[PDB]
Each structure stands twice: as C-alpha cells, then as structure tokens.
C-alpha cells in the first residue's frame, strides 16, 4: 500500500545515481521500481537530485498544471533528469526502454501536510 507522496518517490526519484544514465538505465530502473508490473508504464521521468531539493520545488514558482487542475510548481534550477520511453517493439511483460538523460526544470504537483510532490507534471528547458 502506497501514499501519493511515496508513489511519487518510487516512480520519479533517483537521488543516489549518476546524472548521465547509461543506455540500460531505464530498462533496469523501470523494472526495479515496479513500473513494468502489470504493464509497461509507457513513459516515465526520474530525477537525479536530493529529495529535499525536489520537495523544495513545492515552494518555488507556481505554474499552471498541464490539465489546468491542481497546484503545480516549476523548479528555479535546471535539474538532472532521465526520460524513459517504452520502445515501439516492446510488449508486456517484455518492457524495453530508450533512456534519454537531460537537464530540465521540473514541474510537479504538490499537496498535503507536509506540502510535498505527488505528481510529475512536466519538464521544460527554459528558465522563468
């Protein structure tokens, strides 16, 4: 059983690994984080920063969520992330992923007390 904040950490936090993800990173991480259980999660972003730095985004720039609902926030700084995208050829339970490391501002939806990330909304290159 899992809280929204915990699900966010499981799906999106990778604090203790290198930023420049190897080509196998997504294959391994999507498996290890249970995102290939039941189905291949089609796309997923991991954030290679300290948990506190990501949580602090909840107190940074308030921006509109992609679906116009909830409370989203954009990081002041560009963060190390990795996008994982399910390969066209993959079919569950064979879940293969292309790994794309980049540095981007993250946009997360925050909620609760404490007020913490519960949804990875988007990433964008530009500051402001």
Residues belonging to the binding site for substrate are: 7, 10, 41-45, 66, 85
DSSP states of 57-126: GGGSEEE--TTS-S-EEE-SS-EEEEEEEE-TT-BTTB--EEEEEEEEEEEEEEETTTTEEEEEEEEES-
Contact flag: residue 121 with Cl ion (CB under 5 A): no
CA distance 92 to 36: 8
Looking at 12, 48, 80, 105, which residue is catalytic?
12
- Which of residues 28 and 43 has its CB atom nearest to Cl ion in the complex? 43
CA distance 19 to 47: 9
Contact flag: residue 100 with Cl ion (CB under 5 A): yes
Single out the residue of 58, 83, 84, 110 in contact with Cl ion (rule: CB under 5 A): 83
* Contacting range for Cl ion; rule: CB under 5 A; set: 26-34, 37-45, 58-66, 97-105: 97-105
Interface residue list for Cl ion (CB under 5 A)? 83, 100, 119-120, 124-125
């Amino acid at each position: 059983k899992e809280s929204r904040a915990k699900k966010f950490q499981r799906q999106h936090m990778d604090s203790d690994s290198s930023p420049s993800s190897s080509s196998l990173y997504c294959n391994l991480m999507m498996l290890l984080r249970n995102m290939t259980q039941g189905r291949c999660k089609p796309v997923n972003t991991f954030v290679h920063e300290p948990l506190v730095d990501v949580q602090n985004v909840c107190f940074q720039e308030k921006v509109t969520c992609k679906n116009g609902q909830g409370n989203c926030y954009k990081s002041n700084s560009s963060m190390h992330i990795t996008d994982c995208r399910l390969t066209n050829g993959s079919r569950y339970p064979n879940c293969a992923y292309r790994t794309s490391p980049k540095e981007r501002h993250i946009i997360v939806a925050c909620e609760g007390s404490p007020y913490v990330p519960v949804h990875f909304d988007a990433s964008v290159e530009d500051s402001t």
